[PDB]
């Protein structure tokens, strides 16, 4: 029983975590290989945040202008180049803790495990999700970008996500491990803002399956639903819609509950329309949307 | 900004977990130098001492991963098994045993087949029991804080009792609460919620923007803990106001000041509003974890 926000064991990656410093500026970089992956903001300066012209930054670069330190050890950057928005430093030693991984780029609603590092050192992990509007809901200070959160299938690391920026709501953004950002937002000074974002709708059902095999139950009706009827209303509390494709992907959790997933559906409806009457599910007094189908599977039975 | 169930990162602890089979029965096992600690009931109206003098090296199969470690010895502590192998760990980190009071925070790193499955972050209930998530075959999982390069241990799973919440030991074998290692009928005994991390929360979402529960009023510090046990809260003491001091230095908002706020919110509800992404009061984040976590 229980359920929790279960981020993957991060040692995998604690040994990828090392320290980046071009002039002044330092943050975190992921030593893979030979190569080691970071922020292009780092080549940044004062005179230069509103409008910065990343190839002349970097062609007035040298391998020494930057520092790579993994712990204790320097590391010697034997050439530099950039991708998109990510910066790729070789370096002379591959790392030996370099463990066997992917570069994947995730859907709006997944989730994954955050290690957010600061001069290189771990402080903790966490679990989000990449919401609709390509955000992510962190807990990020000053010096954590490069910081990256992943998934871990065994014992292959799929890496999704690399901090780069705070925006004025608090909330937090970032690229792939390719340099392509999360959502409509570049590394440089202009009024770019989180639009209106939605709850993703799976994700709630598969929380709600996740109560019933705890015991969670008062909010099962004798109903059921369309989809459509279901869609109708979900729209109007700023829900994603559902497909059939989630309804497929939630079929599992349906089979071991022996809830159909428009049944529980029809479940859904009804809180939206008359609330919690104050009880809780889940030891949660809100309908939570951060958990997908496939983590209450790996959480729960 | 932001705010996060924040657990420590894993990695000093995974270099420690293996798995034991004792006859039939397999969970995890903790790897310290050439001892791994494990529950004694692997070895499972009983009697231990019997039990375990009937039982040989051999009764253990230890296995690091493909590495299978060969028993040389067993001993007992309290009610936890303590298996000396022929070879010490050599990811054995500087840590240490301790064991943590009603309202500590620590992270939980939920082991099956002596493999890792994930971390999350749990709180010492009251009543000595744990809200975590265990499965069969999680047994033996560890809880933990980490000082800089220092593991320090100071709970082992055990149970899952008729609730769904847990309970274990101490590293020295030693139970948390009033449950014990056979068929009975210990359950969980009423539980309360732990106000200074309430307030240490309510500190977290000032530092994170959320301020809205900030109010003109002032309380005493009796005064408060009167109306908190009349809704099922732990007492607050001097001491707690001491604790907190550093975050209302921080933010600016007197101890007994937030109590205010609190008081109000207590008898008032949250009105619908939000805090910290939670429609409730969140008592499982310490003054400490709150300082690690911010500013
Ligand atoms: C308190 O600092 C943080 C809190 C939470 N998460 C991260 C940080 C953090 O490390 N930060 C330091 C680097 N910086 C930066 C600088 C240049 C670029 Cl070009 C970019 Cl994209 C990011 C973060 C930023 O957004 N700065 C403001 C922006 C600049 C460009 C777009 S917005 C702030
Ligand atoms: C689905 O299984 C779990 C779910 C969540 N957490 C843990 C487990 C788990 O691995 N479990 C397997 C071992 N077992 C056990 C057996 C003997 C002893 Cl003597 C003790 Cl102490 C514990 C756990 C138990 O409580 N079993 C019932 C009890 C026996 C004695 C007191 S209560 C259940």
């Not at 190839?55 to 010697?76: C, M, P, T, W, Y």
């Not at 799976?202 to 639903?225: Q, S």
């Not at 159909?260 to 009804?270: F, G, H, I, N, T």
């Amino acid at each position: 029983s229980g359920f929790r926000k279960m981020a993957f064991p991060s040692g995998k990656v604690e040994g990828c975590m090392v320290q980046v410093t071009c002039g002044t500026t330092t943050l975190n970089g992921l030593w893979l290989d030979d190569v080691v992956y970071c922020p292009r903001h780092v080549i940044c300066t004062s005179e230069d945040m509103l409008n910065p012209n990343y190839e002349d930054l970097l062609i007035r670069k040298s391998n020494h202008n930057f520092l790579v330190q993994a712990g204790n050890v320097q590391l010697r950057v034997i050439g530099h180049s950039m991708q998109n928005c990510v910066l790729k430093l070789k370096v002379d030693t591959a790392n030996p803790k370099t463990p066997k991984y992917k570069f994947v780029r995730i859907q709006p609603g997944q989730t994954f495990s955050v290690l957010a590092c600061y001069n290189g050192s771990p402080s903790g992990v966490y679990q989000c999700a990449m919401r609709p509007n390509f955000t992510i809901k962190g807990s990020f200070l000053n010096g954590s970008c490069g910081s990256v959160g992943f998934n871990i299938d065994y014992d292959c690391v799929s890496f999704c996500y690399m901090h780069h920026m705070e925006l004025p709501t608090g909330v937090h953004a970032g690229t792939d491990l390719e340099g392509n950002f999360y959502g409509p937002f570049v590394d440089r000074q202009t009024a770019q803002a989180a639009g209106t974002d939605t709850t993703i709708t799976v994700n709630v059902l598969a929380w709600l399956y996740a109560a019933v095999i705890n015991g969670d139950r008062w909010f099962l009706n004798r109903f059921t639903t369309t989809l459509n009827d279901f869609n109708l209303v979900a729209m109007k509390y700023n829900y994603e819609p559902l497909t059939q494709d989630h309804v497929d992907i939630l079929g599992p959790l349906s089979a071991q509950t022996g809830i159909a997933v428009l049944d529980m559906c029809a479940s859904l409806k009804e809180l939206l329309q008359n609330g919690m009457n104050g009880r809780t599910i889940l030891g949660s007094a809100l309908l939570e949307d951060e958990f997908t189908p496939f983590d209450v599977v790996r959480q729960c039975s």
